[PDB]
Amino acid sequence: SVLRELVTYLLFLIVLCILTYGMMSSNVYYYTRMMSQLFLDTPVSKTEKTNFKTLSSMEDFWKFTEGSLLDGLYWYENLLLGVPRIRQLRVRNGSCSIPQDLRDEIKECYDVYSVSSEDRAPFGPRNGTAWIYTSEKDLNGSSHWGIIATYSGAGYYLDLSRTREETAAQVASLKKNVWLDRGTRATFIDFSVYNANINLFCVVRLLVEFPATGGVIPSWQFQPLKLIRYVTTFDFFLAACEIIFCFFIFYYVVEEILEIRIHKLHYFRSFWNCLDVVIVVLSVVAIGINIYRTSNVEVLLQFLEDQNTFPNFEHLAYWQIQFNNIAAVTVFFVWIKLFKFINFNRTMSQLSTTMSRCAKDLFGFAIMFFIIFLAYAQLAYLVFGTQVDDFSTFQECIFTQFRIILGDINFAEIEEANRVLGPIYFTTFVFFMFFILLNMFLAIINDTYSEVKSDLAQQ
Amino acid sequence: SVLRELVTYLLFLIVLCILTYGMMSSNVYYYTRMMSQLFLDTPVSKTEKTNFKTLSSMEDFWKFTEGSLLDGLYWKMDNRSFIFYENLLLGVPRIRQLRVRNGSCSIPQDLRDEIKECYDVYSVSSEDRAPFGPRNGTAWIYTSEKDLNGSSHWGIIATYSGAGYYLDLSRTREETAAQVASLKKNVWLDRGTRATFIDFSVYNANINLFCVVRLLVEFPATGGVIPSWQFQPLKLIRYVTTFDFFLAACEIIFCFFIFYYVVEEILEIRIHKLHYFRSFWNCLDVVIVVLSVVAIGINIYRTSNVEVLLQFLEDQNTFPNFEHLAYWQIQFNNIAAVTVFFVWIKLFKFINFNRTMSQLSTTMSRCAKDLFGFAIMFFIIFLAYAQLAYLVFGTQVDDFSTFQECIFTQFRIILGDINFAEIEEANRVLGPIYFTTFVFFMFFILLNMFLAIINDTYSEVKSDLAQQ
Amino acid sequence: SVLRELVTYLLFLIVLCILTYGMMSSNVYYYTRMMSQLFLDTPVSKTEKTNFKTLSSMEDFWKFTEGSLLDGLYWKMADNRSFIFYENLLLGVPRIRQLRVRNGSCSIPQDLRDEIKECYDVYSVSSEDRAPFGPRNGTAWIYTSEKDLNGSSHWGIIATYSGAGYYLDLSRTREETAAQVASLKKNVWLDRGTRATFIDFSVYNANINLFCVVRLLVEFPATGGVIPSWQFQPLKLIRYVTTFDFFLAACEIIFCFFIFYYVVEEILEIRIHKLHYFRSFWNCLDVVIVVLSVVAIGINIYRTSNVEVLLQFLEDQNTFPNFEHLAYWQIQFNNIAAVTVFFVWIKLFKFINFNRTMSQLSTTMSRCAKDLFGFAIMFFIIFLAYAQLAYLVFGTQVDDFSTFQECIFTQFRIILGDINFAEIEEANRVLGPIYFTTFVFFMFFILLNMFLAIINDTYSEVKSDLAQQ
């Protein structure tokens, strides 16, 4: 009856497990450590200890862009794959309204970054393309969604060279004619690498944000890509597994459309059918991303030998990230669907009936729990927001509250920032979470279990 | 009926949130962060690895003042000083110490033949009010609290006063260094010194936000140094942008809501339903109204009491007195945060839109007199353990040095965030006994008693409402 | 009536708190912290990063004695006194003392009596050396008895040492203590037979009225290595100075009167009425409190009445102040007072019955104690089985299971999640993960829930019985 259904699903599960195991051991994560450590951890020179992880000004950034960058870009032992690009976004003088109370000394004001306040005039000597505005369309750029703002794709860009002898000269020329004024608000550096020692790709992005209050906020992201081809037999086995998984999910969506065709009258009143639909949509988006990257990985090999043109390879990294994050939740949902099927004996029948008969009550109390949770998170944001660095943003406040529930409290800066109303908040939060609120879920489950056992016994 | 109350409560909550996050400028953290990293983490000199956070003596303070402070204060492009090329230093900084007099404490007659001086711990009754050193300037002459425009501080060791021996520094670096060198030559920090303060302010005209800095160094009566700091941003030129006018309009609307709520509360307390505090929502409304009125009072008091800013602006070569404004800003922020928390908690009055939520609310309500009655006993045991820990470990751990610190350590014990390598070496017996018994009684007795009360109450409430 | 008992207990509690928290006065934590940071955390020299807390050999100890110790002891301004923080006065001179064992004090196998020549046992009073050695000139090379040294046993980490040994009294200035220590180092003073070394001194700090007694102990185990330990204790020996001291004395007298009254009342209530008197748990608490209080009073009387060492020091202040027994008895008195305060606060449960909510909870606890004891026997038997298995398997490798008590402490910490599974997995790749996983699973899934089952059953039973009746 359900033997085939269970069997098909079990077959489907082992295919996913094999694919994940093949994906879990790509020997790439080691490579990304040992490639990021070259740029973000090597001092700028033999004298200073400053690196990209701990930038603190503009002069050290100028030191970094001629030095620890060129030193690690031309010499694990990766090599270049084209020409890199440096771009900046900046605001315009007079973007503010200085209060009339004090204007005899404050002559220049630059607002925080925004599209309305962005500068478009040609500044400095108009010799090249770094001293003139180019729109987002002309650069084929997109948003970045940085730390303190979101940055567009336009700006003042300049493509570097393939030989360090000329890249150093041109970056020194850009340093001589002052390029990073007070209005500079962000700076991007991008390039691509091959590392011919091991066949594995990567695209890099380096960001420096200049706040209106002084200082720098360095940010980075490394995302490798794979050019997997028919090399070994295990690769052939994985490819065959991928193909049979594509056919299996095709069959599965056929049965799903059949289910929604004959049983269209009611298909969302059950919790499991929603699981099936989310699983199938995540699977289809994952396979779409996979086929997209497989189609587009062949375009990029033109830059391996010699091409003096910047390769625009950020969408590949974005979609690789999305693909990984979709695959993780997909396999989690598949394992939960497996957890559904265990209803063989009377004991498991009682357990499943108990878990199913107390779903609306648990959902109902989740609302109260999260109302209290977000009230506490908002209190923490309003009290420690400016000082602690663990509560600087609302979502970071929520994450810190979840970590505190799992016993990862600090309480050092919490008490230092506010000697009263900080300890009060911590003690009340701990007392109410660990003794009162979290026990309501258990109370609901206990009462439902007792009711189910009594009902079956009297039946 | 209830819909009108719900919608007016929703509008009140919306305007309150808009007010709170209007003055909660995004990414204001990095301004104070850069200031702290500049004035705290910087080593006092190129050779030394000591900074302000790790001061341990008085020569360390003298090296810091002539070192990291004069580097982080004065920048070159009587010209002005821009800290990060954006932050402008307003006026001059001020340094001020508090002293005690020889003879404030008495030496026993047994040891009077080898110990002469005796300086008490800091107190107002034992404070030095006499000139000393080369008595020519204001750094060697006592100036009272009112003649100096100060107030109490409440440091770590004690609560210091607003008087003492002060000196207003200069606008440039060349002569400020000379002033500090002269204060170092003629000994300014003797054995009598009990505290020292440094204050200054910056503007950063890009955003419209002042910053007030205070660095406190306490010299305890046993020897040593306890450093402290405080960076607080302020906004005193509010009306600059259109969003500021929007915020002012929301402020007026919020005052209108608070007045309406006060009128209704007086009406419902004076004649109708006298002594109606038997409910919970009424008490919650009273707390919210009282907190809102206190916040409005503070805002009214310190929204037009900005004549210190005008007095600085008419002559910018003086010390800007912005400490009271920072203190009242901090108090206002605390009151507003608590008010927002309680307004959010009030939302439970309206979530009864089905049977499940109503049943959950009833179960949570009917277990209020039992959980409170057992929380009394829980806290009796908790405070007994805290007292024992204070009496045993209060001299040597740093986590039990004060009673409140003892209480905080215990809530942290439950989360497993302890050392136990310092509890066990502080007292080899009665330390492990403490830890073992505390863990056993917290996890195996009282937690299960809380859960038992909750379980029994939920079952009884559900059964009785279902049967009725 | 009950109000009389309540008010008398409240007055007793108030007096006891006044006394104990007057002893725990304004921050002496910083007084202790300054000294400990000055001596323990100061690196032995400019280049090396070694401090007293991380000694590893004999040469490290010799660097510490000639290095950070003299710098932290003697401060500058004719051979004047040294004020440690310009405020703490070094009293008299410090003393250094060691313990030794005899050459050939063990048993070595006859199959190696030509390969192994010298042997020194672990420390024991039957194995300690008592003969002159080296350049037998002064008191550093001649054994001096415990009675002649006015000392006592210390109970260090490894063993309980004696009050005797080879001692030397240092000087009042750096230029002479340095020479004395250099002469001790040249004519080798620390051989392989050394088993311990002590350093003692005291300071005053007249700004407050509080002595500090410091002892630094370094043990050399028979298997090699160094184990450092320390002890900083503040004392008040000149009590009556200010008016608050007179207030504390009056409170002391009042507390003694309360203890006498309680003793006579409990004696007259155990004389005839209720000759058993012990099956109440409140009478047991009363007698526990009375016994602890009279022990504390006796210790206080027999330690304060003996400040004769202070007088002897005050006659001539170029001698070693012998404030060791005073610090020891101060520590004992502090422990007894802390426990007494704990139990007096716990006795407050006798009066919180003002309504039904507290009454039913107290009844629930009383009626569940009898079953929780029965289950706790089994819980602790299983706990001790796990502890002994961990001691026997991981005891020689992990450093967290070296002794049975350490195994119990480690298991209680594991219950909190304060453990490092990597260290216990490396020691034994099999039976390590099994022990940890099975312990966590059975402790949290089975043992922690039977307690809840019993508590909930008894609570529901008593609530329903009261409601029905």
mmCIF file of N, CA, C and O in Angstrom, chain C residues 57-116:
data_model
loop_
_atom_site.group_PDB
_atom_site.id
_atom_site.type_symbol
_atom_site.label_atom_id
_atom_site.label_comp_id
_atom_site.label_asym_id
_atom_site.label_seq_id
_atom_site.Cartn_x
_atom_site.Cartn_y
_atom_site.Cartn_z
ATOM 1 N N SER C 57 60.383 25.399 37.075
ATOM 2 C CA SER C 57 61.613 24.722 37.465
ATOM 3 C C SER C 57 62.226 25.453 38.652
ATOM 4 O O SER C 57 61.653 26.406 39.188
ATOM 5 N N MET C 58 63.403 24.982 39.066
ATOM 6 C CA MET C 58 64.130 25.615 40.161
ATOM 7 C C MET C 58 64.766 26.929 39.729
ATOM 8 O O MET C 58 64.801 27.891 40.509
ATOM 9 N N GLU C 59 65.285 26.988 38.500
ATOM 10 C CA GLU C 59 65.892 28.220 38.016
ATOM 11 C C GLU C 59 64.865 29.337 37.898
ATOM 12 O O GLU C 59 65.197 30.507 38.110
ATOM 13 N N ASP C 60 63.617 28.998 37.571
ATOM 14 C CA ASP C 60 62.556 29.999 37.580
ATOM 15 C C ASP C 60 62.352 30.565 38.978
ATOM 16 O O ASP C 60 62.175 31.777 39.147
ATOM 17 N N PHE C 61 62.377 29.700 39.995
ATOM 18 C CA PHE C 61 62.244 30.169 41.370
ATOM 19 C C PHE C 61 63.403 31.075 41.759
ATOM 20 O O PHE C 61 63.204 32.104 42.415
ATOM 21 N N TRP C 62 64.626 30.709 41.372
ATOM 22 C CA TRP C 62 65.767 31.558 41.691
ATOM 23 C C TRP C 62 65.725 32.887 40.950
ATOM 24 O O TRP C 62 66.200 33.892 41.485
ATOM 25 N N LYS C 63 65.191 32.912 39.728
ATOM 26 C CA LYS C 63 64.977 34.183 39.043
ATOM 27 C C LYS C 63 63.937 35.026 39.766
ATOM 28 O O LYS C 63 64.100 36.244 39.899
ATOM 29 N N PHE C 64 62.856 34.397 40.230
ATOM 30 C CA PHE C 64 61.801 35.131 40.918
ATOM 31 C C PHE C 64 62.296 35.719 42.233
ATOM 32 O O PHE C 64 61.963 36.860 42.573
ATOM 33 N N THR C 65 63.090 34.958 42.988
ATOM 34 C CA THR C 65 63.565 35.441 44.282
ATOM 35 C C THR C 65 64.475 36.654 44.130
ATOM 36 O O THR C 65 64.374 37.610 44.905
ATOM 37 N N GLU C 66 65.369 36.638 43.143
ATOM 38 C CA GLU C 66 66.265 37.765 42.922
ATOM 39 C C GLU C 66 65.660 38.845 42.036
ATOM 40 O O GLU C 66 66.279 39.902 41.867
ATOM 41 N N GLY C 67 64.483 38.611 41.468
ATOM 42 C CA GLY C 67 63.924 39.528 40.499
ATOM 43 C C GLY C 67 62.704 40.274 40.990
ATOM 44 O O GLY C 67 62.823 41.273 41.702
ATOM 45 N N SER C 68 61.522 39.799 40.598
ATOM 46 C CA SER C 68 60.286 40.503 40.910
ATOM 47 C C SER C 68 60.010 40.583 42.405
ATOM 48 O O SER C 68 59.327 41.514 42.840
ATOM 49 N N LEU C 69 60.521 39.642 43.199
ATOM 50 C CA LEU C 69 60.248 39.669 44.633
ATOM 51 C C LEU C 69 60.885 40.884 45.293
ATOM 52 O O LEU C 69 60.216 41.632 46.013
ATOM 53 N N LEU C 70 62.177 41.103 45.053
ATOM 54 C CA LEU C 70 62.850 42.243 45.666
ATOM 55 C C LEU C 70 62.312 43.563 45.135
ATOM 56 O O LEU C 70 62.233 44.542 45.883
ATOM 57 N N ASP C 71 61.949 43.612 43.853
ATOM 58 C CA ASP C 71 61.376 44.829 43.290
ATOM 59 C C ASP C 71 60.011 45.130 43.895
ATOM 60 O O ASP C 71 59.667 46.297 44.115
ATOM 61 N N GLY C 72 59.212 44.094 44.155
ATOM 62 C CA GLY C 72 57.897 44.310 44.727
ATOM 63 C C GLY C 72 57.910 44.488 46.230
ATOM 64 O O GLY C 72 56.916 44.930 46.811
ATOM 65 N N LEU C 73 59.019 44.145 46.883
ATOM 66 C CA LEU C 73 59.107 44.282 48.332
ATOM 67 C C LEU C 73 59.641 45.639 48.768
ATOM 68 O O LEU C 73 59.002 46.323 49.573
ATOM 69 N N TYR C 74 60.798 46.043 48.257
ATOM 70 C CA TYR C 74 61.518 47.212 48.752
ATOM 71 C C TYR C 74 61.312 48.374 47.790
ATOM 72 O O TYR C 74 61.619 48.264 46.598
ATOM 73 N N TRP C 75 60.804 49.486 48.312
ATOM 74 C CA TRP C 75 60.564 50.696 47.544
ATOM 75 C C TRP C 75 61.371 51.848 48.129
ATOM 76 O O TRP C 75 61.661 51.889 49.326
ATOM 77 N N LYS C 76 61.731 52.789 47.266
ATOM 78 C CA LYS C 76 62.572 53.914 47.639
ATOM 79 C C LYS C 76 61.711 55.146 47.905
ATOM 80 O O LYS C 76 60.481 55.109 47.793
ATOM 81 N N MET C 77 62.363 56.246 48.264
ATOM 82 C CA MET C 77 61.658 57.484 48.579
ATOM 83 C C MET C 77 61.836 58.532 47.484
ATOM 84 O O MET C 77 61.065 59.487 47.396
ATOM 85 N N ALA C 78 69.122 57.081 55.698
ATOM 86 C CA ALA C 78 69.746 55.909 56.300
ATOM 87 C C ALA C 78 68.741 54.773 56.450
ATOM 88 O O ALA C 78 67.838 54.856 57.282
ATOM 89 N N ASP C 79 68.889 53.756 55.594
ATOM 90 C CA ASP C 79 68.165 52.481 55.615
ATOM 91 C C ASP C 79 66.723 52.608 56.100
ATOM 92 O O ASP C 79 66.262 51.819 56.932
ATOM 93 N N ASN C 80 65.994 53.578 55.551
ATOM 94 C CA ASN C 80 64.641 53.867 55.999
ATOM 95 C C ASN C 80 63.696 52.723 55.633
ATOM 96 O O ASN C 80 64.054 51.774 54.933
ATOM 97 N N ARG C 81 62.465 52.827 56.125
ATOM 98 C CA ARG C 81 61.451 51.821 55.868
ATOM 99 C C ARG C 81 60.996 51.886 54.415
ATOM 100 O O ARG C 81 61.183 52.891 53.725
ATOM 101 N N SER C 82 60.390 50.798 53.951
ATOM 102 C CA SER C 82 59.900 50.707 52.583
ATOM 103 C C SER C 82 58.382 50.674 52.604
ATOM 104 O O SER C 82 57.786 49.785 53.218
ATOM 105 N N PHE C 83 57.764 51.638 51.930
ATOM 106 C CA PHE C 83 56.320 51.683 51.766
ATOM 107 C C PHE C 83 55.973 51.103 50.403
ATOM 108 O O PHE C 83 56.390 51.639 49.374
ATOM 109 N N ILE C 84 55.215 50.005 50.402
ATOM 110 C CA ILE C 84 55.073 49.213 49.184
ATOM 111 C C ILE C 84 54.356 49.978 48.078
ATOM 112 O O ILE C 84 54.801 49.962 46.930
ATOM 113 N N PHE C 85 53.256 50.654 48.369
ATOM 114 C CA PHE C 85 52.632 51.517 47.376
ATOM 115 C C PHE C 85 52.707 52.972 47.816
ATOM 116 O O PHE C 85 51.808 53.764 47.532
ATOM 117 N N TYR C 86 53.784 53.317 48.519
ATOM 118 C CA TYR C 86 53.935 54.546 49.289
ATOM 119 C C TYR C 86 52.930 54.625 50.428
ATOM 120 O O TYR C 86 52.870 55.644 51.123
ATOM 121 N N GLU C 87 52.145 53.568 50.644
ATOM 122 C CA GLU C 87 51.109 53.549 51.667
ATOM 123 C C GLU C 87 51.198 52.308 52.552
ATOM 124 O O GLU C 87 50.915 52.381 53.751
ATOM 125 N N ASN C 88 51.583 51.171 51.977
ATOM 126 C CA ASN C 88 51.687 49.913 52.710
ATOM 127 C C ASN C 88 53.081 49.796 53.310
ATOM 128 O O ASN C 88 54.072 49.792 52.577
ATOM 129 N N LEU C 89 53.161 49.670 54.632
ATOM 130 C CA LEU C 89 54.443 49.631 55.325
ATOM 131 C C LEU C 89 54.884 48.193 55.559
ATOM 132 O O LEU C 89 54.168 47.419 56.198
ATOM 133 N N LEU C 90 56.066 47.844 55.058
ATOM 134 C CA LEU C 90 56.628 46.521 55.303
ATOM 135 C C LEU C 90 57.065 46.413 56.759
ATOM 136 O O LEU C 90 57.926 47.171 57.213
ATOM 137 N N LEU C 91 56.480 45.464 57.485
ATOM 138 C CA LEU C 91 56.744 45.300 58.910
ATOM 139 C C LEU C 91 57.939 44.376 59.103
ATOM 140 O O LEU C 91 57.895 43.202 58.719
ATOM 141 N N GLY C 92 59.003 44.897 59.709
ATOM 142 C CA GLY C 92 60.163 44.095 60.043
ATOM 143 C C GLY C 92 60.907 43.527 58.854
ATOM 144 O O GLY C 92 61.329 44.268 57.963
ATOM 145 N N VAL C 93 61.089 42.208 58.841
ATOM 146 C CA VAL C 93 61.836 41.532 57.777
ATOM 147 C C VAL C 93 61.074 40.298 57.336
ATOM 148 O O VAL C 93 60.310 39.700 58.105
ATOM 149 N N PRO C 94 61.253 39.901 56.079
ATOM 150 C CA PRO C 94 60.683 38.637 55.608
ATOM 151 C C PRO C 94 61.601 37.449 55.878
ATOM 152 O O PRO C 94 62.814 37.584 56.044
ATOM 153 N N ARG C 95 60.990 36.266 55.911
ATOM 154 C CA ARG C 95 61.687 35.029 56.241
ATOM 155 C C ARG C 95 61.459 33.999 55.147
ATOM 156 O O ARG C 95 60.333 33.846 54.663
ATOM 157 N N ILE C 96 62.521 33.291 54.768
ATOM 158 C CA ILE C 96 62.461 32.219 53.781
ATOM 159 C C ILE C 96 62.836 30.912 54.469
ATOM 160 O O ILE C 96 63.770 30.869 55.276
ATOM 161 N N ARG C 97 62.089 29.851 54.169
ATOM 162 C CA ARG C 97 62.205 28.594 54.897
ATOM 163 C C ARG C 97 61.946 27.443 53.936
ATOM 164 O O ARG C 97 61.067 27.539 53.079
ATOM 165 N N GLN C 98 62.706 26.355 54.080
ATOM 166 C CA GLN C 98 62.548 25.197 53.210
ATOM 167 C C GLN C 98 62.442 23.922 54.031
ATOM 168 O O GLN C 98 62.737 23.895 55.227
ATOM 169 N N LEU C 99 62.025 22.856 53.353
ATOM 170 C CA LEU C 99 61.954 21.513 53.906
ATOM 171 C C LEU C 99 62.729 20.557 53.013
ATOM 172 O O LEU C 99 62.756 20.715 51.790
ATOM 173 N N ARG C 100 63.361 19.560 53.626
ATOM 174 C CA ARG C 100 64.211 18.642 52.888
ATOM 175 C C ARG C 100 63.884 17.209 53.275
ATOM 176 O O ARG C 100 63.213 16.947 54.275
ATOM 177 N N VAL C 101 64.365 16.278 52.453
ATOM 178 C CA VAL C 101 64.295 14.852 52.732
ATOM 179 C C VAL C 101 65.707 14.283 52.683
ATOM 180 O O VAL C 101 66.640 14.911 52.183
ATOM 181 N N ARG C 102 65.850 13.073 53.207
ATOM 182 C CA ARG C 102 67.155 12.467 53.414
ATOM 183 C C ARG C 102 67.612 11.711 52.175
ATOM 184 O O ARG C 102 66.805 11.137 51.439
ATOM 185 N N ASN C 103 68.923 11.715 51.952
ATOM 186 C CA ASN C 103 69.506 10.929 50.872
ATOM 187 C C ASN C 103 69.401 9.448 51.203
ATOM 188 O O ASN C 103 69.747 9.026 52.311
ATOM 189 N N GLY C 104 68.940 8.656 50.243
ATOM 190 C CA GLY C 104 68.719 7.247 50.499
ATOM 191 C C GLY C 104 67.613 6.975 51.492
ATOM 192 O O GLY C 104 67.778 6.135 52.385
ATOM 193 N N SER C 105 66.491 7.677 51.372
ATOM 194 C CA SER C 105 65.351 7.487 52.256
ATOM 195 C C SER C 105 64.269 6.606 51.651
ATOM 196 O O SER C 105 63.192 6.482 52.242
ATOM 197 N N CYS C 106 64.524 5.990 50.501
ATOM 198 C CA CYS C 106 63.552 5.138 49.832
ATOM 199 C C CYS C 106 64.111 3.718 49.768
ATOM 200 O O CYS C 106 65.116 3.389 50.406
ATOM 201 N N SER C 107 63.451 2.877 48.978
ATOM 202 C CA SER C 107 63.944 1.553 48.623
ATOM 203 C C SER C 107 64.135 1.489 47.115
ATOM 204 O O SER C 107 63.191 1.737 46.358
ATOM 205 N N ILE C 108 65.343 1.162 46.680
ATOM 206 C CA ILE C 108 65.672 1.021 45.262
ATOM 207 C C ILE C 108 65.941 -0.452 44.977
ATOM 208 O O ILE C 108 66.478 -1.149 45.846
ATOM 209 N N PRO C 109 65.568 -0.965 43.804
ATOM 210 C CA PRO C 109 65.771 -2.393 43.528
ATOM 211 C C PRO C 109 67.245 -2.768 43.507
ATOM 212 O O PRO C 109 68.108 -1.976 43.123
ATOM 213 N N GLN C 110 67.522 -4.002 43.930
ATOM 214 C CA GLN C 110 68.886 -4.516 43.960
ATOM 215 C C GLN C 110 69.456 -4.765 42.572
ATOM 216 O O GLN C 110 70.679 -4.861 42.432
ATOM 217 N N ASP C 111 68.608 -4.874 41.550
ATOM 218 C CA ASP C 111 69.080 -5.071 40.188
ATOM 219 C C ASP C 111 69.664 -3.806 39.574
ATOM 220 O O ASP C 111 70.317 -3.891 38.529
ATOM 221 N N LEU C 112 69.448 -2.643 40.192
ATOM 222 C CA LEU C 112 69.977 -1.386 39.686
ATOM 223 C C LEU C 112 70.800 -0.622 40.710
ATOM 224 O O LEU C 112 71.020 0.579 40.525
ATOM 225 N N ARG C 113 71.267 -1.272 41.767
ATOM 226 C CA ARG C 113 71.979 -0.561 42.824
ATOM 227 C C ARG C 113 73.343 -0.067 42.387
ATOM 228 O O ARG C 113 73.976 0.695 43.128
ATOM 229 N N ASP C 114 73.813 -0.477 41.209
ATOM 230 C CA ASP C 114 75.009 0.093 40.611
ATOM 231 C C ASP C 114 74.703 1.111 39.522
ATOM 232 O O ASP C 114 75.624 1.803 39.074
ATOM 233 N N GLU C 115 73.449 1.218 39.083
ATOM 234 C CA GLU C 115 73.056 2.217 38.099
ATOM 235 C C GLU C 115 72.381 3.430 38.725
ATOM 236 O O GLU C 115 72.502 4.536 38.188
ATOM 237 N N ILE C 116 71.685 3.252 39.847
ATOM 238 C CA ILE C 116 71.020 4.339 40.557
ATOM 239 C C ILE C 116 71.646 4.442 41.939
ATOM 240 O O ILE C 116 71.652 3.464 42.696
#
